[PDB]
Every structure is written in structure tokens, then in C-alpha cells.
Ligand binder design. Structure first.
Ligand SMILES: Nc1ncnc2c1ncn2[C@@H]1O[C@H](CSCC[C@H](N)C(=O)O)[C@@H](O)[C@H]1O
Length: 266
């Protein structure tokens, strides 16, 4: 419970202590955990998924396998947590949303009711199927920057460390964000450990290095204002949320340490 959300606010720098928002384990988080515990109890389905995965991981990424089997869904924030972090009301709506590296869209649908048009990018073929099943407009990874129109909210959750050019991405996002009321939602697992996902436990180094240093969560968060400022952003709000993932035969679920930011352009 509290270990996922608590923060040593005294270790944060001046800028960050003002914009920090405290999050809590609400019912939306508890519904995902209970659903995850239920799914993980189905031994034979998990065994079948495990054996299919062990064969398909010889030529397929773990992400594409999860999208093929409809498994491994994840959780970043509840609708309530998303609204409290963005400082909006449940009825708030705007025009366009762009979710980069949206995966199977289970996190995207948390933000989806607040938008009229939803766009996504995704490298995995099977995940693209999941996004199209939700009727999102999927764009190429080098197509969303050159559409002509801008985006009110650009979401970039748990992608910077899985990306080959995170610095270019942050600047590409700034170029097509709506200047007046546009906002960026960004999530990162800390400690920052970047790698490009490939096939069968194979990873590569990113081409562009983000200078995210520190020996704990607060020190690494302190290193990010410079990174965000280099791309033309300032932190309007940020919080500490557990990055949750559905489980398997051995664990009911998995937890990672997410730092979630709301960025406004400057
Ligand atoms: N260059 C790229 N362009 C678009 N998607 C990418 C990408 N590189 C990796 N991805 C995708 O980004 C995802 C990272 S996992 C993040 C999934 C989801 N946004 C969440 O927070 O839960 C994977 O689905 C991966 O296939």
C-alpha cells in the first residue's frame, strides 16, 4: 500500500516540492489487483500461455506475444487518479489525444473518455490489432508528427526508456502539441534503465542517452527538470504511482516504480 505512493519530499529540489501531488490506492487500483489475482489463479490457461510464450519468444518479442494472447495488461492510474493529477473534473473533455507506444490500450482507455478523437502509435503488430479493436486511429511512428493538426494531450507512458531516440521524441512531441492548453502526460519507471526491446530476452542500447542519475526515486526525479526543460517543458504536476502488470503462474501481479508527470509547454 503506502510503500508504492510515499515520497521523501525533503529530498526533492525546490521546483519539484511545489508541484508534487500525493496519490493513494483507490478502488480503481484495487479492481485491477483483484482482477489480476483472479486471472492468475487459472493454472491451465497460464500454463498454455507460458508454453506458447516459450516457443514464440524464439522469433517474437514479449510485447507481441502478450498482444497475441491478450495477456499482460498493465495499470498506471485509475480514472480518478488521472483526473486528480491533471486537475480536471470527470466531465472534462477536449478534441484530440495522442498516446505514443499505447500497447494494448488498457491504459489508454483510462484517459479515453475525456477526448473526441484518439490517436496512437505502436511498434508491435499484435498490439496494433488491440488498438484498432478499440477503434483508435493508429498512426505510423514517423507519421504523427506530420499530420498537419496538433494534439491537445500527448500521452507518453513508460516509453522513453524503451525508445531508441528519447530526446528526439520529446522534441517531436513539443512540435505538435497545442500551445495554449496542451498538456503532456509522461510516465517513467525509476531507476531509469533504458533498453530497446527485441526478440527473446534480447535488448539494445538507445541511440540517445537521457541523463537521469540518482541512487533513489527522489534523486532521479531531481534530474528530470533539466531533461524536460531541454525539450521545452516544465512540470505542472507529478506523482508516484505503482506501475502494475497482470501476473502468471508464479505471481498474482507485478509492480514497478513509476514517476508520472504532467508537462506544459514553455
Ligand atoms: N518507437 C516506438 N514507437 C511507438 N511505440 C513503441 C516504440 N518503441 C516501443 N514501443 C512500444 O511502447 C510500449 C512500451 S510498454 C508501454 C505501454 C503502455 N504505454 C503503458 O504504459 O503501459 C511497447 O508496447 C512497445 O512495443
Amino acid at each position: 500500500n503506502h510503500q508504492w505512493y510515499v515520497c521523501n519530499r525533503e529530498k526533492l529540489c525546490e521546483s519539484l516540492q511545489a508541484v508534487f501531488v500525493q496519490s493513494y490506492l483507490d478502488q480503481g487500483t484495487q479492481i485491477f489487483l483483484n482482477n489480476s489475482i483472479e486471472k492468475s489463479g487459472w493454472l491451465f490457461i497460464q500454463l498454455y500461455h507460458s508454453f506458447v510464450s516459450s516457443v514464440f519468444s524464439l522469433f517474437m518479442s514479449r510485447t507481441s506475444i502478450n498482444g497475441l494472447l491478450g495477456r499482460g495488461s498493465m495499470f498506471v492510474f485509475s480514472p480518478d487518479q488521472f483526473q486528480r493529477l491533471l486537475k480536471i473534473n470527470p466531465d472534462w473533455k477536449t478534441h484530440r489525444l495522442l498516446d505514443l507506444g499505447a500497447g494494448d490500450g488498457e491504459v489508454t482507455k483510462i484517459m479515453s473518455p475525456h477526448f473526441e478523437e484518439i490517436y496512437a502509435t505502436e511498434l508491435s503488430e499484435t498490439m496494433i490489432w488491440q488498438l484498432q479493436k478499440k477503434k483508435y486511429r493508429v498512426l505510423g511512428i514517423n507519421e504523427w508528427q506530420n499530420t498537419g493538426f496538433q494534439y491537445d494531450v500527448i500521452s507518453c507512458l513508460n516509453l522513453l526508456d524503451r525508445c531508441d531516440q528519447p530526446l528526439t521524441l520529446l522534441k517531436d512531441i513539443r512540435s505538435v502539441l497545442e500551445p495554449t492548453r496542451g498538456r503532456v502526460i509522461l510516465a517513467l519507471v525509476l531507476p531509469f534503465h533504458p533498453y530497446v526491446e527485441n526478440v527473446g530476452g534480447k535488448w539494445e542500447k538507445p541511440s540517445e542517452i537521457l541523463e537521469i542519475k540518482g541512487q533513489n526515486w527522489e534523486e532521479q526525479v531531481n534530474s528530470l527538470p533539466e531533461v524536460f526543460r531541454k525539450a521545452g517543458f516544465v512540470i505542472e504536476a507529478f506523482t508516484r504511482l505503482p506501475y502494475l502488470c497482470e501476473g502468471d503462474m508464479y505471481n498474482d501481479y507485478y509492480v514497478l516504480d513509476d514517476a508520472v508527470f504532467v508537462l506544459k509547454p514553455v
